[PDB]
Design a protein around this ligand. Structure first.
Ligand SMILES: O=P(O)(O)O[C@H]1[C@@H](OP(=O)(O)O)[C@@H](OP(=O)(O)O)[C@@H](OP(=O)(O)O)[C@@H](OP(=O)(O)O)[C@H]1OP(=O)(O)O
Lengths: 836, 572, 122
RNA sequence: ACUCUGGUUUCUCUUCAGAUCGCAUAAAUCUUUCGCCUUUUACUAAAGAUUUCCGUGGAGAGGAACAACUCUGAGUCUU
């Protein structure tokens, strides 16, 4: 037990991994198998999956993992070397992408999981991109190999064909996301593992070569581990592996020396269990008693495969030599994560992960207790050492060097490293490891840079947790009895803490609004809000979708705005951006930190913008990645550049906030270009203050937007469904009912299931996940995630459109129906006026 | 039995439903010694088994207790914890394909799980295929929630209506006040299983139901690979682990297809269940819906599911006991003996015993104007004068006992008709199903305990379920169904329910000694009695005890004075 | 008529006698929309059939979609055994169709004791 | 490949029962809430709390049958 702490002290025998993968792909069962390997007293039930890491009750009843769970375990390697493994088995549901990112910032390794009978799915398509964008080594473990044999009953050659088709599709798809050309995955190289979690089967080519070497002996398992995967074969007469076929009915090496023995052993334990089973266990050295042979087929298969393969050494040596150690992976993690990068003193102090250096651990999760009162933070100690009772300094997400007010000095109460259900109390946690810090819940929402007090003077914070999806769905929350409203404020704060992309908000009409990704996500968060944190009654409005406001054409007149003093006068024009330019802003392709020359060349080549304005672009919409843009287009002779540069900041401040709110209603402004045609600034810095410019800035922005023909943009969810070919029409009929349209219907190779990829309006996608399965009697299944935004049909600003109370309106009325009710939901005026 | 009873209903153009009662009246049940013992029984309903396939079960399939003697398969005569080989189990599974839906996963039960039904009950909402329930809490005022600024219509966008199944799938998002609600989203990865149909085929075959992989080599996506005779050599000893053993045996396809069999047929071994506790058509009304069936069987499906969900919800763990068996104490007693006997003899014996009991109960007060016939019908020997009519009346318990005796007498007489060659085995089964599906019509027991209507309706619902599944294709409509075990068990659960009630009422009735607006009467008399008891108790035992009425009058006067709000102060 | 029914449902949401036969008012399968009025019956890969219903009745009643899919994918080299097994089935249940025959076209010599009882019962 | 190893079945008695005792499912009583409401006996149909009933698992004890054919782990596991 103390060897756990001894290995904990070292920083090179430690791996930080995430077993990220699609929904229901065996990740939780894989961790359960690892636990069953380590802990002997923990034995899985004969039929019910134990689901060890599924510790909260809601995922124990719904059957889907919801929140990532830390697992700290010592795993022997193929050669028997112990390694300390930090496992963050992220939930697989695409609506739960919050926890994938939350566990991916604090990990250096990505262990993908792909169902052998399902192939690459929607989820994985985004996790490979995300992990590459976060600069982690990516490794694939095709799980549920049993499906190719006990369910599909494929010939072993076709099983290998399926395996290579799903292996190279990962390589082919990842080549778009990965700039480097060292990221080619192949089991012969050691990137790819093969496993069946239910039957505990797990191997890399090296491990299986180790089994053969163990049996026959005098075998070098490395050379034989190579020359297994591929189109090469084996010659029984010359005992050499050849590219060409040694016989007419030849067979690939992998199939011949790995897949075929698996087929035979599991067929012997599911067929002729009574006649030819002892014969095939004598030939394999697996000795069993009478009472362990009287079990059912599934437990017998799991036991026999545990005896044959043994411990999960294949996963261990797959992980060890193909993901960097924290001492090695710290440099890319820091240069992508720390705001100042490696260049700063603290940045250079991170490249080596010194256990005695400065402590600026990073926490990215909130694992509540069983009473829900206090929140135990979870984070990685990127460097330094932490102790129980140590007086520590917790930073925030708005904390900077200039803004020293966003921090708190706290006392680390206790420290313990956690493995799912049970936690191990430790007085000291060294660098490069994980920990649940206690007593730091008060000054944190979501991420935090918990660092030393009065010891890290110039230390900055870590970058905000950037996600892959966007919080789209929006639900109103109120107490049943307003006499217990404060009881619900703290519950909303708690759920905001325990959900990385949850966005609580109070609006002008005294409305509490919760933002989420999908139906199941909001179901889980409100179940937590009701039965866990607030233990009161809560009324919910039916889900509504956040909208966006855009333009399609230039304004008829150059509408302007002046300060109340009638001295400053700013004239601006709102026009749409080039198709695809908005995406090239949100993807961090271009930034405001760029120098002028690079952005000028970018807009001169890719978007053919004139250099007279390409070097006169101030801001990029709201926040930093906002899709809108502010453009300076005043001729220098009429607007003094020296005089302009004073309000150059305030105009942006009134613009970065001007586009955030939106004149039509309190919704984001997207895909709009603002050209300034005239500036009349006060010649003295006295009357041109921010309190006068900023209202004028927002007013001129709103006036230009309104005078330009405005439109609403609704977010479309990208829905994939997997159904047998008899139910493809049953998906077309459902998707046609909700204004959707199908993009592709591709059968999955090596499986009768299909994959129908379509788009569906988010406001029109409520219940579709149930409207499909019930219509197809549960055979079909859908997953949804936000893809893009589209102009809502119709003109949002027509007064001839009448909104009936309780029946859907046609497409042309939608743009009018959506905002007005939204306006009514916002508490604003019924219509829009040019004064706004 | 299901696969053949559908054939004789298709073979016999007309069918003769056995008479009911199958026996005449005023005639005692036939003696077992003279008639039943000698007559050779007719052939029973049995399927000829194909020795080419059904051989593993050919030797013993239609025995009384199959494999009772075989120590290899069963533990012994206690007949528990059977062990069955895979060929045996596969043969049984193939033979039971008519009573087994071919569902591999449970994704077909998306919103027809019992957890979803618990949710629907706790929400006072009904799945279209699901049952209706009374509200858990009336909350009529909570139903009449006022038009607030929260639930205001003009603030709500309606695109697609929030259907009940939406509020059931996500009972914490689409609705309010979700008390005693359960969750289920068990979208198990839909198992992609393709059961073989070819008797001759490789077990691991690439059947066309699988979309081809379509392997390609267009782009030179090469990987580290060796050349011929490149720094490697294999030992002569080393080989693939299993070379001698074939890739697939004959029992491989059956074994793999046995993985995804229903619950009973995925066990290599397991404990033994009773004949009562095996619901054969349980997985029939649990199905999603009947495919375009009339209303009188759709409502039957909802009414079966309603009772199923009610039993599932109201289930409680059994209470810890001390295991006092009843017949074992009888065997201990000197008054009883054990003997192997034919069942029909036992029925003819018990009918006479119950008839004698009821005649004794009738002639308990020596009233000769009530007579019980041999069909358990209580009739007057002469037109009843009103005094004698009222003088000879029995409570609901006696009538219930008489009617259940009539039911068992009907069953026994039907079996006797079978043994006497009066009816066929098919006729016997159809008659038994009619008895167990029309107990109300044949016996007026519901007039003596109203709750029986449930069972009555239950059985009728079961009929509808089996019939619509029985009268399918070329079978047609007629009295040719003998699948009685579906409704036969229900009256046995009714029997275990009513056994102690009758065993207590008869005990009270048939014994040497017979035994047979209350809160305002509670605290007046008891309190005053306690006060007087204490006062007289501590009052000295002399002649002064003549003053008890004085104390009672003082108590009454004080109570009156408090009631009259008048000062009460006795000086002495 | 679906539109009026669904709008009406929206308005609904947001605003002694020993009888044995049940009532038709307890029926719940009534639906105002097609996607639940007419649910896509599970073809179950065509090789799986509902328990109670007869097998070949389902086979001929089946949508045949997987039948034509197999006709498309199956190659000639592995159609011979399909045709052979199909014809062998047709022959072996033709055995039952002819050997087990109604007495209306069974002669006296063909007619057996079971068929004799069938005729006498008729 | 040497050893000691050593029964399962069956019928009872006595307790403990966590667990789907039971991959099944009845009845009664009581307290609330409805429905009916004309009084008991039947009910109504949900809730809660009880009890009996048909069964069950485990442990132990006592007999009987295969009690003596075996058999299992242990071992130094002896060319
Ligand atoms: O009169 P219907 O409602 O159309 O149904 C009848 C009725 O049975 P149910 O009324 O109970 O459904 C018949 O006689 P009873 O049952 O009323 O005495 C008989 O049913 P039995 O076979 O049980 O006598 C018959 O069935 P079949 O056509 O199979 O003879 C059929 O019932 P189904 O409508 O369920 O077929």
């Amino acid at each position: 037990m103390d060897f756990l702490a001894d290995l904990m002290d070292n920083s090179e025998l430690i791996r930080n991994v995430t077993l990220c993968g699609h929904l229901h792909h065996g990740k939780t069962c894989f961790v359960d198998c690892l636990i069953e390997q380590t802990h002997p007293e923990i034995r899985k039930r004969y039929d019910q999956d134990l689901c060890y890491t599924d510790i909260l009750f809601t995922e124990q009843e719904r059957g889907v993992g919801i929140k990532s769970t830390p697992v700290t375990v010592v795993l022997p390697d193929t050669k028997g070397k112990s390694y300390l493994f930090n496992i963050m088995d992220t939930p697989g549901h695409v609506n739960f992408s919050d926890e994938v990112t939350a566990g991916l910032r604090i990990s250096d390794g990505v262990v993908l999981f792909i169902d052998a009978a399902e192939g690459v799915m929607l989820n994985t398509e985004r996790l490979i991109k995300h992990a590459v964008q976060e600069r982690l080594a990516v490794t694939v473990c095709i799980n549920k190999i049993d499906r190719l044999i006990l369910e599909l009953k494929l010939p072993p050659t076709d099983a290998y064909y399926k395996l290579r088709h799903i292996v190279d599709e990962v390589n082919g798809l990842i080549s778009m996301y990965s700039t480097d050309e060292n990221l080619i995955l192949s089991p012969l190289l050691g990137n790819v593992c093969f496993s069946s979690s239910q039957y505990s089967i797990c191997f890399t080519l090296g491990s299986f070569a180790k089994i053969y070497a163990d049996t026959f002996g005098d075998i070098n398992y490395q050379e034989f581990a190579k020359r297994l995967w591929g189109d090469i074969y084996f010659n029984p007469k010359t005992r050499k592996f050849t590219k060409k076929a040694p016989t007419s009915s030849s067979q690939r090496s992998f199939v011949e020396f790995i897949l075929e023995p698996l087929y035979k052993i599991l067929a012997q334990v599911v067929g002729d269990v009574d006649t030819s089973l002892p014969r095939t266990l004598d030939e394999l050295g697996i000795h069993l008693t009478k009472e362990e042979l009287k079990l059912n087929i599934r437990p017998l298969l799991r036991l026999v495969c545990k005896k044959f393969f043994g411990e999960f050494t294949g996963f261990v040596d797959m992980c060890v030599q193909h993901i960097p150690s924290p001492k090695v992976g710290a440099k890319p993690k820091i240069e992508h994560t720390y705001t100042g990068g490696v260049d700063s003193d603290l940045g250079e102090a991170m490249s080596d992960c010194d256990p005695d250096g400065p402590l600026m651990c990073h926490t990215t999760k909130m694992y509540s207790t069983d009473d829900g009162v206090q929140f135990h933070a979870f984070g990685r100690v990127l460097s330094g050492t932490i102790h129980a009772g140590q007086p520590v300094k917790v930073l925030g997400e708005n904390y900077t060097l200039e803004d020293e007010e966003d921090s708190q000095i706290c006392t680390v109460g206790r420290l313990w490293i956690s493995v799912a259900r049970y936690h191990i109390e430790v007085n000291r946690v060294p660098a490069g490891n994980w920990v649940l810090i206690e007593g730091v819940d008060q000054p944190i929402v979501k991420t935090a840079t918990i660092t030393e007090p009065r010891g890290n003077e110039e230390a900055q914070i870590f970058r905000p947790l950037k996600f892959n999806t966007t919080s789209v769905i929006k639900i109103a929350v109120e107490p049943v009895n307003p006499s217990e409203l404060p009881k619900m404020l703290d519950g909303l704060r708690k759920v905001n803490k325990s959900y990385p992309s949850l966005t609580t908000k109070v609006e002008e009409s005294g409305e509490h609004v919760i933002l989420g990704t999908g139906e199941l996500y909001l179901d889980c968060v409100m179940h937590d809000l009701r039965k866990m944190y607030s233990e009161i009654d809560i009324k919910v409005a039916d889900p509504v979708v956040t909208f966006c406001e855009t333009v399609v054409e230039t304004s008829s007149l150059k509408c302007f705005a002046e300060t109340p003093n009638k001295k400053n006068k700013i004239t601006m024009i709102a026009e749409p951006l080039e198709k695809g330019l908005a995406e090239d802003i949100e993807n961090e392709v271009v930034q405001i930190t760029w120098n002028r020359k690079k952005l000028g060349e970018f807009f001169q080549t890719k978007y053919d913008w004139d250099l007279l304005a390409a070097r006169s672009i101030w801001a990029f919409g709201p926040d930093a990645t906002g899709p809108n843009i502010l453009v300076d287009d005043t001729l220098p002779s009429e607007v003094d550049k020296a005089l302009l540069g004073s309000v150059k900041d305030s105009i942006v401040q009134g613009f970065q906030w001007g586009t955030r709110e939106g004149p039509l209603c309190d919704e984001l402004i997207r895909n709009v270009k603002f050209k300034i045609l005239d500036a009349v600034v006060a010649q003295e810095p006295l009357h041109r203050g921010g309190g006068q410019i900023i209202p004028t800035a927002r007013r001129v922005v709103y006036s230009a937007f309104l005078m330009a023909t405005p439109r609403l943009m609704e977010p479309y969810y990208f829905v994939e469904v997997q159904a047998p070919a008899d139910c493809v029409s049953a998906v077309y009929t459902v998707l046609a009912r909700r204004r959707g349209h199908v993009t592709q219907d591709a059968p999955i190779p090596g499986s009768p299931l299909y994959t129908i990829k379509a788009f569906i309006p988010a406001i029109d996608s409520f219940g579709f996940e149930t409207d499909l399965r019930t219509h197809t009697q549960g055979q079909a299944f859908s997953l949804s995630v936000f893809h893009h935004w589209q102009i809502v049909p119709g003109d949002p600003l027509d007064k001839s459109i009448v909104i009936r109370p309780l029946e859907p309106q046609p497409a042309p009325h939608l743009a009018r129906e959506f905002m007005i009710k939204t306006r009514r939901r916002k508490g604003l005026s019924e219509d829009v006026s040019i004064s706004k | 039995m299901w696969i053949m009873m559908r054939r004789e209903k298709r073979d016999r153009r007309h069918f003769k439903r056995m008479r009911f009662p199958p026996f005449d009246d005023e005639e005692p049940p036939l003696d077992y010694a003279d008639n039943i013992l000698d007559v050779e029984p007719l052939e029973a309903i049995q399927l000829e088994l194909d020795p080419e396939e059904d051989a593993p079960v050919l030797d013993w399939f239609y025995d009384h207790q199959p494999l009772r003697d075989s120590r290899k398969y069963v533990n012994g005569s206690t007949y528990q914890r059977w062990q069955f080989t895979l060929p045996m189990m596969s043969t049984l599974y193939r033979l039971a394909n008519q009573l087994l839906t071919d569902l591999v996963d449970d994704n077909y039960f998306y919103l027809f799980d019992l957890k979803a039904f618990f949710t629907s009950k706790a929400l006072n909402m009904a799945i279209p295929g699901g049952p209706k329930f009374e509200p858990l809490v009336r909350d009529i005022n909570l139903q009449d929630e006022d038009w607030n600024e929260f639930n205001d219509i003009n603030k709500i966008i309606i695109r697609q209506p929030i259907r009940t199944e939406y509020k059931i799938a996500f009972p914490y998002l689409y609705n309010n006040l979700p008390h005693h609600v359960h969750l289920t989203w068990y979208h198990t990865p839909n198992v992609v299983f393709i059961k073989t149909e070819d008797p001759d085929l490789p077990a691991f075959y690439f059947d066309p139901l699988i979309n081809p992989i379509s392997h390609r080599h267009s782009v030179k996506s090469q990987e580290p690979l060796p050349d011929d005779d490149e720094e490697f050599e294999l030992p002569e000893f080393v080989e693939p682990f299993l070379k001698d053993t074939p890739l697939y045996t004959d029992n491989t396809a059956n074994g793999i297809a046995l993985l995804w069999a229903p619950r009973p047929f995925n066990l290599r071994s397991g404990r033994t269940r009773r004949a009562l506790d095996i619901p054969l058509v349980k997985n029939w009304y649990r199905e999603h819906c009947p495919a375009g069936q009339p209303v009188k069987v759709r409502v039957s499906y909802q009414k079966l599911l309603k009772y199923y969900v009610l039993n599932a919800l109201k289930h409680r763990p059994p209470k810890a006991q001390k295991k006092r068996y009843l017949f074992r104490s009888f065997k201990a007693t000197k008054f009883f003996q054990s003997t192997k006997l034919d069942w029909v003899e036992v029925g003819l014996q018990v009918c006479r015993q119950g008839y004698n009991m009821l005649n004794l109960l009738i002639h308990r007060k020596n009233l000769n104007y009530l007579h019980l016939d041999y069909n358990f019908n209580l009739k007057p020997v002469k037109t009843l004068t009103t005094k004698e009519r009222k003088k000879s009346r029995f409570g609901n318990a006696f009538h219930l006992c008489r009617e259940v005796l009539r039911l068992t007498k009907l069953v026994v007489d039907s079996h006797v008709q079978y043994r006497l060659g009066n009816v066929d085995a098919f006729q016997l089964a159809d008659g038994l199903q009619y008895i167990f599906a029309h107990v109300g019509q044949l016996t007026g027991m519901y007039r003596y305990k109203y709750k029986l209507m449930r069972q009555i309706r239950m059985c009728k619902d079961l009929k509808h379920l089996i019939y619509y599944r029985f009268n399918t294709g070329p079978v047609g409509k007629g009295p040719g169904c003998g699948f009685w075990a579906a409704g036969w068990r229900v009256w046995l659960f009714f029997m275990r329910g009513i056994t102690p009630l009758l065993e207590r009422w008869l005990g009270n009735l048939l014994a040497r000694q017979f035994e047979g607006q209350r809160v305002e009467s509670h605290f007046d008399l008891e309190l005053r009695a306690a006060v007087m008891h204490d006062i007289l108790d501590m009052m000295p035992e002399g002649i002064k005890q003549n003053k008890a009425r004085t104390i009672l009058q003082h108590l009454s006067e004080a109570w009156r004075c408090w009631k009259a709000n008048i000062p009460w102060k006795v000086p002495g | 008529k679906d539109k009026s029914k669904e709008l009406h449902a929206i308005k609904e949401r947001y605003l002694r006698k020993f009888v044995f036969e049940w009532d038709a008012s307890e029926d719940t399968s009534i639906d105002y929309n097609p996607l639940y009025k007419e649910r896509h019956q599970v073809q179950l890969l065509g090789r799986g059939f509902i328990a109670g219903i007869d097998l070949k009745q389902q086979k001929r009643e089946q949508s045949r979609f997987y039948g034509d899919l197999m006709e498309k994918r199956r190659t000639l080299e592995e159609k011979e055994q399909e045709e052979a097994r199909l014809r062998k089935l047709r022959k072996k249940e033709a055995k039952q169709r002819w050997d087990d025959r109604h007495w209306s076209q069974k002669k006296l010599d063909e007619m057996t004791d079971r068929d004799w009882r069938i005729f006498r019962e008729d």
